[PDB]
Scaffold this active site. Structure first.
Site, PDB file in Angstrom:
ATOM      1  N   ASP A   9       2.865  11.515   2.608  1.00 34.69           N
ATOM      2  CA  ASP A   9       3.906  10.609   3.097  1.00 34.69           C
ATOM      3  C   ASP A   9       5.173  10.600   2.255  1.00 34.69           C
ATOM      4  O   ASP A   9       5.108  10.694   1.028  1.00 34.69           O
ATOM      5  CB  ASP A   9       3.367   9.178   3.119  1.00 34.69           C
ATOM      6  N   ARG A  17       0.909  11.726  13.639  1.00 38.30           N
ATOM      7  CA  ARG A  17       1.867  11.848  12.542  1.00 38.30           C
ATOM      8  C   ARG A  17       1.753  13.219  11.893  1.00 38.30           C
ATOM      9  O   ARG A  17       1.399  13.323  10.716  1.00 38.30           O
ATOM     10  CB  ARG A  17       1.646  10.767  11.471  1.00 38.30           C
ATOM     11  N   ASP A  30      -3.671   0.355   2.071  1.00 38.19           N
ATOM     12  CA  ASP A  30      -3.177   0.708   0.740  1.00 38.19           C
ATOM     13  C   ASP A  30      -3.724   2.029   0.203  1.00 38.19           C
ATOM     14  O   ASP A  30      -3.390   2.426  -0.913  1.00 38.19           O
ATOM     15  CB  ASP A  30      -3.471  -0.426  -0.253  1.00 38.19           C
ATOM     16  N   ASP A  41      -3.195   5.201  -0.094  1.00 39.72           N
ATOM     17  CA  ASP A  41      -2.264   6.334  -0.112  1.00 39.72           C
ATOM     18  C   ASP A  41      -2.879   7.566  -0.761  1.00 39.72           C
ATOM     19  O   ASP A  41      -3.482   7.468  -1.829  1.00 39.72           O
ATOM     20  CB  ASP A  41      -0.995   5.952  -0.870  1.00 39.72           C
TER      21      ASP A  41
END
Length: 330
Positions: free
Chosen positions: A156, A207, A112, A114
């Site tokens: 993201d 990523r 979680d 972020d």
């Protein structure tokens, strides 16, 4: 201003900045805001990262996250020397947002945790977002009991956030740098149009970015010490990969781990020393750009003007300009 798919972004424009010293004050200012017309938040808090004595305490603690939800015309800017141990989400029918000069590190929340997350939902999808001159870091440490999630995403987007520039950011000591499309079933992400330029990606795992569907322009980025994979284009997505500087990176340009491959248009990339390649486990199709050969032509006009730093000068240019506390140098 912004260059690329987020070029129209103005955020809160010339509105008088509201000084906010904590993430609570930042959230309160957002909550009081009418939702359009312009809001500028000057973040002045100076989090002491030395207070985090154990980099594995973080994942089990609840996330600290500021939310811009269904509100538009917002700038969040860090004052020079400001530091945040909280993250930022922009969610739903939320448009025209600037996030700039923030130093965001070592966040609580694990999966979680972020850092900067832009999220479409049933109410709408964010657009005109400029993520610029931020410094985002965590740890590559895989904590006992954490699963794969001692920390989470760096910069993201998902569910069809579109028209975004991600520029001059510094992302280091970070496992999962940039998600673009959350799963193979994220069909709204066909809409994504993202320019990643002049970013510093150093000492990171993967990523960089992970692209599912949509179109991207990935240019003038500096990659160093990227240990699993770099640009990962998947699910029919196409990336225009132009004049980046690559060194000490495994799988710099690949398509892997999706049910369908994505494609690249490669030009003028500086390929330094320390490039390695590997084969993914599993039976899903993959492609490695071993010879730096384009697999598709970028299928439309980018519809914007941009100026290219010569690829060999990118390392030095990006080191000079990327991240927070650089006076927003370009």
């Amino acid at each position: 201003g912004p260059v690329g798919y987020g070029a129209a972004t103005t955020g809160g424009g010339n509105k008088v900045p509201v000084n906010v010293a904590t993430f609570e004050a930042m959230q309160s200012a957002i909550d009081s805001y009418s939702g359009s017309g312009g809001l500028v938040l000057n973040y002045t808090g100076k989090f002491d990262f030395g207070t985090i004595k154990d980099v594995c305490a973080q994942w089990k603690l609840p996330a600290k996250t500021v939310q811009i939800k269904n509100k538009s015309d917002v700038t969040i800017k860090g004052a020079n020397g400001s530091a945040a141990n909280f993250g930022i989400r922009v969610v739903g029918n939320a448009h025209n947002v600037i996030i700039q000069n923030m130093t965001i590190g070592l966040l609580q929340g694990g999966e979680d945790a972020d850092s900067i997350s832009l999220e479409g939902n049933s109410s709408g999808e964010p657009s005109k977002i400029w993520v610029d001159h931020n410094t985002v870091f965590a740890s590559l440490t895989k904590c006992s009991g954490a699963g794969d999630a001692s920390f989470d995403g760096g910069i993201d987007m998902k569910k069809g956030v579109h028209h975004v520039t991600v520029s001059y950011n510094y992302v280091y000591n970070y496992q999962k740098v940039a998600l673009n499309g959350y799963s193979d079933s994220d069909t709204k992400n066909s809409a994504a149009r993202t320019t990643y330029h002049h970013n510093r990606f150093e000492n990171v795992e993967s990523r960089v970015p992970l692209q599912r569907r949509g179109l991207s322009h990935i240019y003038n980025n500096y990659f160093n010490n990227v240990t699993t994979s770099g640009i990962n284009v998947r699910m029919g997505g196409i990336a225009k990969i132009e004049s980046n500087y690559f060194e000490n990176i495994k799988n710099p340009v690949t398509s892997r781990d999706s049910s369908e491959i994505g494609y690249w248009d490669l030009i003028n990339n500086y390929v330094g020393s320390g490039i390695t390649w590997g084969t993914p486990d599993g039976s899903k199709p993959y492609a490695n750009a071993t010879n730096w050969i384009s697999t598709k032509v970028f299928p439309e006009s980018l519809g914007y003007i941009y100026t290219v730093t010569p690829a060999a000068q990118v390392k030095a240019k990006v080191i000079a300009t990327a991240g927070a506390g650089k006076n927003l140098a370009e």
